[model samples]
Target chain A: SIGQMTDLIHTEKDLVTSLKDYIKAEEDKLEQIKKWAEKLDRLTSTATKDPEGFVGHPVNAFKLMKRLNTEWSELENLVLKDMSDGFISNLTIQRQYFPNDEDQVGAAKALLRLQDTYNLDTDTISKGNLPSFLTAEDCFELGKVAYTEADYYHTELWMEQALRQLDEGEISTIDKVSVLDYLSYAVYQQGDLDKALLLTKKLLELDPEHQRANGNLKYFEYIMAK
Target chain B: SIGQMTDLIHTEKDLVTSLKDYIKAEEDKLEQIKKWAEKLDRLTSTATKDPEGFVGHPVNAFKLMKRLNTEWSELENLVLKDMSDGFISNLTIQRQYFPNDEDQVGAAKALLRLQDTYNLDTDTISKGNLPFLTAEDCFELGKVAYTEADYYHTELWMEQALRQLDEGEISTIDKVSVLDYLSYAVYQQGDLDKALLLTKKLLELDPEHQRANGNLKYFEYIMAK
Candidate 1:
């Protein structure tokens, strides 16, 4: 029935309740897609486990085709098309299934790029640019650099920059909740009491059992003698 | 006369070098002060290793007197009084060291303030806030979140935010090297492999051996196909 209602509404459901339904429905689709993604993940795992199985039947590379196709199609028809509907929220689920997937890819690409650069006498290991050049990892690293230095001004700048990145278009409100959990921590560290409190309130809104925020709230109370 | 003139220039050279040497000596003093900071770091590390030893000490309790006095005096005499001597760099260094040693303290203070309004319902475990907050550990987690979904926008946005924050301030000169590195990596990953190589080569002017810049150079040479 809800699926039918979704069909009627097309993609125009922006109400919190409607969005919840949409999130739930997309979550269902994500579950289905994830099963397929899981299968591929398993195949990839197997490839690692029995490298011979993959290398012996080099055509086994085609196993990825099925998984990739499944992911591509479902992602195309479902999540990508209805991005706001919590398609990206599937990131939470995929994290459950494939935690190392993206980082491995990014790291691998990064490593390959690094190797190629060695021949050219170039340097790429240090921190330099932020906005156009640096990736999220680099930005976080820079924040850590500043934070470690107790450069709160710079730390604040970097952490806030890192937090804002988590709010990109693909991130859903549900997922954004997770990003804010981190954002608040960095902002809080910089002695921005008010901003920190606001973010904690946000965390409480999404996660009543959010032990850290709840604990933080109590610590705040204790200090305030409330 | 020629010998005298040579000696005069050498005297100036020595004078300039002496200022640089004084700067370097001051630099060494600041370095030792940082060594004290590092010792505090080791002390904290010891506390972490022996939590039982940490109980009564308070925050740098036994050592704070000695450490703070030294840190303060060193800072005052070296940088505060001599701002024109490029001591700003040392200030930047101290700023970095303070938080790494006392992150939980900062978090604790914030928690105290936050609980004033919202009130904690649970026992304090770790401080909380926005999802994947700005801790050093969380960036990897955020990246993990992105790679899972193969969600480019999340990756892009997260990276963009991180970049903006880390490279935000400082003179444009300090910002250039890291930017070159990041650009080098992105270019190599995408279709413009050639441009990546060129950018990587340009980074030689810098000393850091930045990965992205280096990778760009390597990728472009192979891309001639």
Candidate 2:
């Protein structure tokens, strides 16, 4: 077990290094893109005599300009995604090392930088007419990922969204039971202890032998008594 | 060259095996989760008297339940993320092997599965906002499209890669390769003249460019025909 724990620590260290390196690579690319954009701006402003003179034809120049615009746009998206991935990875590492609420909130705030900048909030789907592209299973999985990262807000958002999309006929009874189980905790993490217990009760109705619910029920009752 | 190709082939095989094994492990965990769910279902349904009499105090049950749920959910996400990572890794491997339209589409679809499922599309910014993601994504998307035989997208993606490279003073060789790939895609789509033009452009940039020089001779031969 110690060996396994050591391996995990090493893995986390490697992931941290890999993610930071990737961010650095993206930053370098961004720096290059800026230089290119600036050079192009200067070329277009000052020297109109076919700046690169490499295209051979005037029509080709138009193609080059269009390509330049497209390339610039793509590069910009690339940098942002890389940065988001980096922040999320860093948050994952932070949570592993420090499991305190303060650290979790710090990581959550960093994650929000990406969320706010990209307006990722609107991406959430309400119940019914779930986009053809997304499935309840996918939503549930994403929620679980959010929960693991201590992004309880998104965990609550996604689990509820996942529940809305999940249909009894579409998912197995067991799968449905598990999602309910997770949703209870997701809500609990969001500070709705009573609602969390209600979810477990609902889960118990679906699967009475559920080990987690059986155990969680007593805990919730104790909390209620307190 | 044969040794290198063999190494690549061996590397791809290993990747495929690793991905399948990872998927298998996730499926096994899902099965265990299902069984646990089923057993819980039975326990709650049959016995009503504070079922888990194993705990001395109900408070202990609360701790167990909380820990169980936390551990289970963490395990669940662990499996899912590992699977997603596997799929992405698989797609990367596929690209290295079969650089064709079909495989590219396959990789693109896999990526879209991750994107759509995770709402990765909304992650992209429109033309003006300080788009922070790099051209690595564009190059990747382009590679998949190029493999899928979607020449137009390939052209578009490669162009983005070219721009990324053109910006980097150190990436001339990479840019040249991307241009060559774009030229190959362009010519395959019946733009022989345009393709020839790109090859010539490559030759101009690197006079002794081996691939472009070879390709230009071949293009000329075809044009003569």
Model 2, residue A16: C-alpha shift (Å): 34
The C-alpha stretches of model 1 lying farther than 4 A from their native spots are A1-131, A170-182, B1-225
First chain TM-score, candidate 2: 0.43
lDDT of 2 by residue, A104-218 (tens): 3443344434444644541332222222133566456556667877777777766766776666344622377868977898888778898989999999998989998989999
Query: Number of the top candidate by DockQ?
Result: 2
For residues B58-132, what per-residue lDDT tens digits would candidate 1 score against the true structure? 222212222222333443344222311343343333233222313332332333334335543211212232121
- Candidate 2 - CAPRI tier? incorrect
Give model 1's docking category: incorrect
lDDT comparing candidate 1 with the true structure: 0.40
Instruction: Provide a comma-separated list of chain B TM-scores, one per candidate.
Output: 0.26, 0.41
The reply for model 2, stretches above 4 Å from the true place, is A1-132, A168-174, B1-225
Error of 1 at B122 (Å): 86
lDDT, candidate 1, A1-226, per-residue tens? 2342222122211222332344355346445644644554454555555554443321232222222233234433442333232523432332232213343333333432443454321112222221102334433444455555555554455445555555443232234454455557667666666777888888798888888889887775565454
Q: Provide the TM-score for each candidate, comma-separated.
A: 0.21, 0.25
Worst 10 residues of 2 chain B by lDDT: B122-131
